[PDB]
Design a binder for this molecule. Sequence first.
Ligand SMILES: [Mg+2]
Ligand SMILES: [Mg+2]
Ligand SMILES: [Mg+2]
Ligand SMILES: [Mg+2]
Ligand SMILES: [Mg+2]
Ligand SMILES: [Mg+2]
Ligand SMILES: [Mg+2]
Ligand SMILES: [Mg+2]
Ligand SMILES: [Mg+2]
Ligand SMILES: [Mg+2]
Ligand SMILES: [Mg+2]
Ligand SMILES: [Mg+2]
Ligand SMILES: [Mg+2]
Ligand SMILES: [Mg+2]
Ligand SMILES: [Mg+2]
Ligand SMILES: [Mg+2]
Ligand SMILES: [Mg+2]
Ligand SMILES: [Mg+2]
Ligand SMILES: [Mg+2]
Ligand SMILES: [Mg+2]
Ligand SMILES: [Mg+2]
Ligand SMILES: [Mg+2]
Ligand SMILES: [Mg+2]
Ligand SMILES: [Mg+2]
Ligand SMILES: [Mg+2]
Ligand SMILES: [Mg+2]
Ligand SMILES: [Mg+2]
Ligand SMILES: [Mg+2]
Ligand SMILES: [Mg+2]
Ligand SMILES: [Mg+2]
Ligand SMILES: [Mg+2]
Ligand SMILES: [Mg+2]
Ligand SMILES: [Mg+2]
Ligand SMILES: [Mg+2]
Ligand SMILES: [Mg+2]
Ligand SMILES: [Mg+2]
Ligand SMILES: [Mg+2]
Ligand SMILES: [Mg+2]
Ligand SMILES: [Mg+2]
Ligand SMILES: [Mg+2]
Ligand SMILES: [Mg+2]
Ligand SMILES: [Mg+2]
Ligand SMILES: [Mg+2]
Ligand SMILES: [Mg+2]
Ligand SMILES: [Mg+2]
Ligand SMILES: [Mg+2]
Ligand SMILES: [Mg+2]
Ligand SMILES: [Mg+2]
Ligand SMILES: [Mg+2]
Ligand SMILES: [Mg+2]
Ligand SMILES: [Mg+2]
Ligand SMILES: [Mg+2]
Ligand SMILES: [Mg+2]
Ligand SMILES: [Mg+2]
Ligand SMILES: [Mg+2]
Ligand SMILES: [Mg+2]
Ligand SMILES: [Mg+2]
Ligand SMILES: [Mg+2]
Ligand SMILES: [Mg+2]
Ligand SMILES: [Mg+2]
Lengths: 270, 134
Amino acid sequence: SELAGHQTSAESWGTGRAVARIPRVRGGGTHRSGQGAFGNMCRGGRMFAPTKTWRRWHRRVNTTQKRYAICSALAASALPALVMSKGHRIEEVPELPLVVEDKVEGYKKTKEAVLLLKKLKAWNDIKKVYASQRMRAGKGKMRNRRRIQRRGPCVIYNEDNGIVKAFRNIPGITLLNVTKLNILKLAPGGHVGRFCIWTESAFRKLDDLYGTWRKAASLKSNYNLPMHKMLNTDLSRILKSPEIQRALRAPRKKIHRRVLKKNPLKNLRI
Amino acid sequence: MKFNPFVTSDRSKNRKRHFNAPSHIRRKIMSSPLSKELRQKYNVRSMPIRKDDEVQVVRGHYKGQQIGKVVQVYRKKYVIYIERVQREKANGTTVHVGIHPSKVVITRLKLDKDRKKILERKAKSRQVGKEKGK
RNA sequence: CGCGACCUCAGAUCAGACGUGGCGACCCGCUGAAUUUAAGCAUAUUAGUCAGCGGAGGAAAAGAAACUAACCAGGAUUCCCUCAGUAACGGCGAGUGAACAGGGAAGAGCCCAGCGCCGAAUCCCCGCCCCGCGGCGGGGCGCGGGAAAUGUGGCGUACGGAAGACCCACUCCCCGGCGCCGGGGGGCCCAAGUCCUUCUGAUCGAGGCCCAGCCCGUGGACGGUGUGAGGCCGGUAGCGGCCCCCGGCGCGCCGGGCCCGGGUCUUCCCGGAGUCGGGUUGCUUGGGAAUGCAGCCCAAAGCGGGUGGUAAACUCCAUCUAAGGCUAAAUACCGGCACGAGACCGAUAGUCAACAAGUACCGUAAGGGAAAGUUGAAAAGAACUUUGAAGAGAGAGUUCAAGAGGGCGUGAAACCGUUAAGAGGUAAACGGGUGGGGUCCGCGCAGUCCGCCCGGAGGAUUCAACCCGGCGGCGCGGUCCGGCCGUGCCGGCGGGGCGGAUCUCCCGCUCCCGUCGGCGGGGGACCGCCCCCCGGCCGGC
RNA sequence: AACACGGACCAAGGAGUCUAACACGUGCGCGAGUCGGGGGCUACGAAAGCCGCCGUGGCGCAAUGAAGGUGAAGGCCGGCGGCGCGCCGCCGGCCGAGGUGGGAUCCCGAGGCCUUCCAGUCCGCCGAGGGCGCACCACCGGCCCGUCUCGCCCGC
RNA sequence: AACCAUCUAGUAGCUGGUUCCCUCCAAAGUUUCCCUCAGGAUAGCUGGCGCUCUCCGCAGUUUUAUCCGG
RNA sequence: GCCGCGACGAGUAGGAGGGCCGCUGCGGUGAGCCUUGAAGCCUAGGGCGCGGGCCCGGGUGGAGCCGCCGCAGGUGCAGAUCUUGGUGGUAGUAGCAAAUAUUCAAACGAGAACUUUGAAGGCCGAAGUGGAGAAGGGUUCCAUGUGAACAGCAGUUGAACAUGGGUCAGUCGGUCCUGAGAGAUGGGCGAGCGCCGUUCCGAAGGGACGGGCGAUGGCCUCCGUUGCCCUCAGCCGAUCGA
RNA sequence: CGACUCUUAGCGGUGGAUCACUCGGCUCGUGCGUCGAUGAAGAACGCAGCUAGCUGCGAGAAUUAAUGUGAAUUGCAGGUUGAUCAUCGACACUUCGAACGCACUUGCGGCCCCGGGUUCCUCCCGGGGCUACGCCUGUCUGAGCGUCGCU
Ligand SMILES: [Mg+2]
Ligand SMILES: [Mg+2]
Ligand SMILES: [Mg+2]
Ligand SMILES: [Mg+2]
Ligand SMILES: [Mg+2]
Ligand SMILES: [Mg+2]
Ligand SMILES: [Mg+2]
Ligand SMILES: [Mg+2]
Ligand SMILES: [Mg+2]
Ligand SMILES: [Mg+2]
Ligand SMILES: [Mg+2]
Ligand SMILES: [Mg+2]
Ligand SMILES: [Mg+2]
Ligand SMILES: [Mg+2]
Ligand SMILES: [Mg+2]
Ligand SMILES: [Mg+2]
Ligand SMILES: [Mg+2]
Ligand SMILES: [Mg+2]
Ligand SMILES: [Mg+2]
Ligand SMILES: [Mg+2]
Ligand SMILES: [Mg+2]
Ligand SMILES: [Mg+2]
Ligand SMILES: [Mg+2]
Ligand SMILES: [Mg+2]
Ligand SMILES: [Mg+2]
Ligand SMILES: [Mg+2]
Ligand SMILES: [Mg+2]
Ligand SMILES: [Mg+2]
Ligand SMILES: [Mg+2]
Ligand SMILES: [Mg+2]
Ligand SMILES: [Mg+2]
Ligand SMILES: [Mg+2]
Ligand SMILES: [Mg+2]
Ligand SMILES: [Mg+2]
Ligand SMILES: [Mg+2]
Ligand SMILES: [Mg+2]
Ligand SMILES: [Mg+2]
Ligand SMILES: [Mg+2]
Ligand SMILES: [Mg+2]
Ligand SMILES: [Mg+2]
Ligand SMILES: [Mg+2]
Ligand SMILES: [Mg+2]
Ligand SMILES: [Mg+2]
Ligand SMILES: [Mg+2]
Ligand SMILES: [Mg+2]
Ligand SMILES: [Mg+2]
Ligand SMILES: [Mg+2]
Ligand SMILES: [Mg+2]
Ligand SMILES: [Mg+2]
Ligand SMILES: [Mg+2]
Ligand SMILES: [Mg+2]
Ligand SMILES: [Mg+2]
Ligand SMILES: [Mg+2]
Ligand SMILES: [Mg+2]
Ligand SMILES: [Mg+2]
Ligand SMILES: [Mg+2]
Ligand SMILES: [Mg+2]
Ligand SMILES: [Mg+2]
Ligand SMILES: [Mg+2]
Ligand SMILES: [Mg+2]
C-alpha cells in the first residue's frame, strides 16, 4: 500500500541541537518522540519505490512462434536419447512414439490402467517418482507449496470416456486433449523430452491438424510446416566423400617448436 | 485433488479450526478405532469414544495388553486420563497422564441407546454405499 | 342590529399518519484554494483537483431527438477498442485537447395537459355485516359525512387521431386461494495394514510382504497425532445416501371484474411564455466577431421556430418540433458481512498493532501514540536432609538432556573476570625478509611398485585345431528372393475431397400481356491442388 | 598527514527503482504484407487452444502544395495535315526503362606442371593477357509537385 | 503574525552520503550564444559496436624547385 | 575445444567484457543428503583459488538442506552531525554545604548514629515550623502484619506493599433569586451546515370571584367535583446565570 | 617469577544478534450488497462462589425459553423422562445520546388512574399511564365595517 509509513506527522527540528536534520515525531513523553518516521533508513518508514500493482506482469507472444515450438517438441519425442537425457526410464519399451489401441478410452478403473502400464513395462518411471516424493526448501513451506515430486509421462486422448477420472489418481500423469495442447506442460523448463503415450485417434489426427510439406493443414486457416534450412545434418559422412577430399590441399600438420639461438662467435659448427 | 472450491486447503485456517474448535466438534475429532472382533460384530470401522470405555494403549511408554478403564475426558487438551497410566510425583501423589485418543483401541463398548442407534445408521450407509457402488 | 351561505386565517395533549440522526468506498448538485511548472513572474498551467456544505441507492445518474449528416443517407441511453496525442486553444511560448462516421457488450419502449365526446359516469373517510388476517385486503349494506365545475374518470398524445356510415372475422384474459406431481439454507453419514523385522526417549523413518509383484483407489489435496504417514482420526472423491425449512414451474376448482376488434369511404380536430431570441456583464469550455451557465434590462411569432462550427443582407434547399413526465439490462465499488487464492512479508519486516491495542502514557484541548512473541513429548515446576534472620546456596532428585529451573530454544561481537603462555624504557599498530619457541597434524619414524624377460621351485581334469547349437557384423550373392518408401517422374474410359473475380440449362420467387424479361438458388461443364487404386520409369532402406 | 571538515566502540536495517513514450543497436518469426492486444466459441487454469464474412482498424506500400488541387522513362521508320530540303502535330511498326569512373567475387585461357627415349588421349592444378560486373561511393542526364520567364499550338 | 492536522515525499543552478572481484581502453578545464560568470546548450576531447578494402594510399619529417612575410 | 608462434601490461573522473563470485525465491533435474544428528555458530587444525570466496577435521546444537540447467528480484555497507538497540574510557572521581544541636541510659529485635519511652540541653517565639478552612488532589485517613523493590547512607519506620474498617442533618451548604451577560420563540438573512437579533414588522391571558343553567359524589344536610354564559385582568418578554 | 600494561586460546559472566517455527497482515478476485422515533450509531454505570483486565451481558444481567446435538465444564471447592455445546423464530433489553414534560443542578414540575391515607378532607406517601418541534388529511371551536343572502 501507498499509505504505509506516511501516516505520521513529523516536523524537523532543523539546524542546531547537533542532530541529523531529519523528520522527527511531534512531541509526547513516550518512547516515540524524536524517534524518526519517514525515510527508507528510518525505522518504520517508506521502502524505496513502493511496489505497484500496475507493473507489467503479462507478456504476450506471437502465434507462429507458439506453433513452431509445439512442432519442435514433438519432433524430439521421437528421439530416445533426448527422452533418456530428461531421465525417463524407458529401455524395455518397444517403440518410442508409443501407439496404443483405442479400447483404453473404455477403461474406468485404476486397477486396470495400472495393470496396463505394467504390461507395457512403463511403471519404473512411476516407481522413480514414488521414491522421489519429498520436501521443499524454504519459506515456500508456509505458503502451501510444501511438497515436490518429479514429472511423469504424458497421456494424450481424443475423447473422454471416463479415462480422465480413471487415471487422475496416479501421481504425475497429465492427460491432454489433442486439439487443445499445451507447451507449458509438454516442455517443462523449456527442456525437450517428455515421455508420451498416444492413442490411435490422436496419432492419426496430427496429419490433419498440422499437415505435411505438400498438403497444408485443413483445420487452421493458413499454416504449413516449418521448413528446413539444411537437410543433411551429418557432416561427418559428408567430409569423407570422394569429391571434397579429392579437392583439398595436403594437411601440413607437423609441429615446429621454438629454436634456441646459439652464438656463432662461440660455437664453431654453428 | 480437491475440486470443491469453497473448502479450504490452507495451513493456518485448518490449524485455527482445530485450536479454536467448539466442544461439539471436538467430540467428533477425538475418535478412536474398534478392534477387528468388534468390527466383525457391528461391521463398523470407528466410533467416538466414551467416558467408561475399556482400552488398550498401543504406543508410548505405557504400551501393552492391559485393558484399562477410562476415568475422564479432557477435551480442552484433546486428551484422556486412564485407570493405571500414571506416575508418582515426588511428594507421593500420583498423576494420571494424558493420552491422545487415536493411540488407543476399544475392547468393550459402554452400550447406551444412542450408541446402538448410531451404529445402525453407519451400517445402513455402508450397505447402501456398497450396493450403490455395486 | 340579529340570523344564515361562502371566503380568508388562527388555536387544540383533537382521531389517524409521515420527517428529524447515523454510515459516507462507489454516486449527484453547489462553493472553491495555493504550494509548483514556465529555468524568473503577473495571463495561462497546477484545476473544476485536495480541503468545506447539503441529498441518495444497491446501484445511481442518463434516456427516446428543438439529433448526426450533407453519402445511394443513418436513428434512444450507457460502456469497450479504434478514430488521436488529430482539427482547435495558448506571453503561438510552456503546455492543454474533444466529437461524428466504423467494428463490438446489452438491446424495450412509453405517459399527461390541451383540443373534444360522454345525466360527475370520480374519490376519500366513517358506521354496520360476511371472509381473510406476521407485506391490513376482498365483498355487501347506510337521506352516513366530506373532496370535486377554480374540472374528477373513461377513450386518446404528434409514429397522426376521432366521430359517422359501409364490409369482414372473432372468441380467452386479469385478480387472489387451496391441494397434488418435479434452485437455496441448516443437520447427520459412507474404502483400505497400526502386518513382519530394525535403530530411537518417543516413531509418521529404513528393510520386507514371491507368478494374485501388501490392501483400496471415481478417494495419493490438507491438518492432527511424543520425529518425516495414501491405508491411526477428522475430512477430500462420487448424477453418493438420509432428514428439516423456504422457494421455484405445473394441474384441477371457487368468488369477482373486462366485453374491446380488421378494412373501406365521407365529414371534422390537432399542441405546453417571463419561455425562445437579442443587447450587456462575469466564469467556465478545444470552440476562435463569444461552446455552455447564470444575473440585469428589453421582449416576440404561427404556411411559424430552432440548427446547418467566420459576423452580416438577399436567397433557394435539407432536417427536426423545445420550453410537462416515467423507464429495467450491459457499467462503477481500497467501506461492510460471509467466502476463495498467491513466484508477497517473516517480529527493527508486514497495517501503527501476530500478545489484555488505538491499550498503557503525554498535552488544558483540538490531537499525538508506543515498547512487548518462542520451556518441554509430558508440569515431570525440584519432596527429603543440611548452613544461614531470610535472600542465597550444598548433597540428593525428574527427564535422553536442566550444557532448557518460570522474560526459561539455539545464545556471536563490543565489554569484563579468572586461568594458561610469552614479553616489556623511545605510545601502540603495520609491510618485506629470516630466526627461535609454542601448538597440534602427518596415525611418518629402515621406505616405489608396474608391465615384460630370464631362472628355479608348486598346482589344476587346462591350450590349439575340428564338430554341433545360438547370436551379431559384412556382402563388388559383380546383377539371390520379396517387401516398404521417395520435398522424384510419366500414363487414367479412375474415384473423390477443397478452392476458383473461367464458363454454364433447369429450378424457386415478384412483376407485365397461356406468352415475354429480372433476381436468387441449383445442378451442369471448365482450371489448380491434394487423397485412394492400377501400370511404368528413376533412387534409397 | 594537516593548525580544512565527519568519525568513542558493536550488531542488525539503509540508497538509479517502476510506468509511458521515443531513438539507436542486437536476437527471433513471417514477408508486400504484417499484428488480435478488444470481443466471441471451447485442482493446477484468472491458463491454454480456436475465430478470418470478427482484418473494422493500426503501421507500411507516394509525395508535394498555405488551400481548391495535382501526382512519378523515352528513342526511331512510313503516313497525314500545316509552315519556314527540314520542322510541328496527328496515325500505324521496332526497341523498349539511363549513362561514366572506381569496384570484392566469377568467366575466357597463350602456355605448361618429369622416369628409359620418343610416340600418345582423358582428368585435375597454375597462369600471361582480356570480359560481364553484386553491394557501395562520386559525378552526369531524366521524371514528379509549387513557383518565375519566354512562347507557340490542340480539344469540346 | 499563535497553536493542531491536511494539501505535502511541496521546489533547490546549493552542502552532505551512495554497498563485490578481475581484465581491457582512457580524458577536460578551450571556441561561440544565453538576466550566462557556483549553471546549460553547442563544437571540441573519449569509448563501444561494427563495416568496406589490403597481405595502391597516408605522414606534426627532410631534400630539390617556387612564392609569401616586414 | 586443444595446440603453436611473435609483440605489449601505470592509471582518477568515465566506458565495456568475463565472473565454477556471492544472496532470496520459482519450473525441471540428481532412484541427491539427513535423528547412526540438518541449518546456524565457535575454532593456535589441514588445504584450494591472483582474488571475490570455497572445501575437508574437531567441538556445540536438535529438523530440515544443498549441487547442476533456466527464470524473476525489495539482492552485497564503515562513513551520511545516518536510524534503532546494546557497551566502553572518562570514574568508584565530581559530588550528597540554604536558614545554630545534639548528648546519656533502658526496651523489642539476628543486627540500631537515625525506631520508641524517660531524662538533660536548644530552636520556631502568635505578620508561627501553631490550631482551622477554600479552589484543587481522590482513599493518601485508622488499625494489624510485611520486610523483595522505593524513600539518592541505613532503617525493626513511612504518605511503599498486603489484608481489613470508616463520612448518618427539616434547622450546615447547593437546591430559590436576580446581577454584568449568554441564549431560544416570532420575524428577517442565508447556495448551505446554520447566523443576526432579545421587544424590534407578532391574534403572545387557559387565570380568578360571584350570579344562572347544566352535571355528579358524599350521615345528598350542607358541602365538594367538572362545564357553559355574563362580568374582570396591563405588562415584557420562554429560559439559564452567585 | 613479583604488581601494572599489551596480545592470543580454553572456561565462566553481561547483552540478545543469527537460524528454525507462524491461530497475523498486504494484495487480487467472487457472491450478497441489510441501520433508525417499534428509540439507531456512540459513551457511561453495573453483573461471576473465589474475577482486576480482556471478552460477553442489561435488574431474568458470562445468560431464559424453543429447536438440533446427546453426557460434561474444569484452575479449585461444591452439587439419558436430557448435563454440556452450537443454532436463534418466541421472550427481554438500565442510564445519557436526534433525545421527546422544562432545565442540566440530576433540580423542578403538570394531567389522569390505582393502593395505603380517609372515614370524600382532602391532604400525605408509593406505583402505573400520558405530556418534543415541524408538516399533511380529516374533526371541532372561533375571528374579520373581506364578499353576499334574509331581515
Ligand atoms: Mg534459510
Ligand atoms: Mg395526535
Ligand atoms: Mg448513513
Ligand atoms: Mg517558475
Ligand atoms: Mg528553479
Ligand atoms: Mg519566481
Ligand atoms: Mg481553470
Ligand atoms: Mg483544464
Ligand atoms: Mg438502504
Ligand atoms: Mg434514475
Ligand atoms: Mg436525467
Ligand atoms: Mg426527452
Ligand atoms: Mg455523429
Ligand atoms: Mg403515455
Ligand atoms: Mg392517461
Ligand atoms: Mg387531461
Ligand atoms: Mg503431520
Ligand atoms: Mg499426511
Ligand atoms: Mg507407505
Ligand atoms: Mg478415514
Ligand atoms: Mg469431490
Ligand atoms: Mg479557461
Ligand atoms: Mg438560463
Ligand atoms: Mg464553420
Ligand atoms: Mg511492528
Ligand atoms: Mg532480555
Ligand atoms: Mg538460553
Ligand atoms: Mg572473530
Ligand atoms: Mg600468568
Ligand atoms: Mg598548519
Ligand atoms: Mg566530532
Ligand atoms: Mg532485437
Ligand atoms: Mg525525498
Ligand atoms: Mg521535505
Ligand atoms: Mg561548508
Ligand atoms: Mg608590425
Ligand atoms: Mg594506459
Ligand atoms: Mg591496466
Ligand atoms: Mg543442544
Ligand atoms: Mg531444536
Ligand atoms: Mg555497520
Ligand atoms: Mg576531590
Ligand atoms: Mg570524597
Ligand atoms: Mg543545598
Ligand atoms: Mg546550616
Ligand atoms: Mg530566631
Ligand atoms: Mg491540624
Ligand atoms: Mg494516614
Ligand atoms: Mg540512614
Ligand atoms: Mg433536628
Ligand atoms: Mg443566536
Ligand atoms: Mg437556578
Ligand atoms: Mg449563592
Ligand atoms: Mg562470552
Ligand atoms: Mg534481535
Ligand atoms: Mg537476523
Ligand atoms: Mg462475568
Ligand atoms: Mg434453554
Ligand atoms: Mg439447542
Ligand atoms: Mg447549575
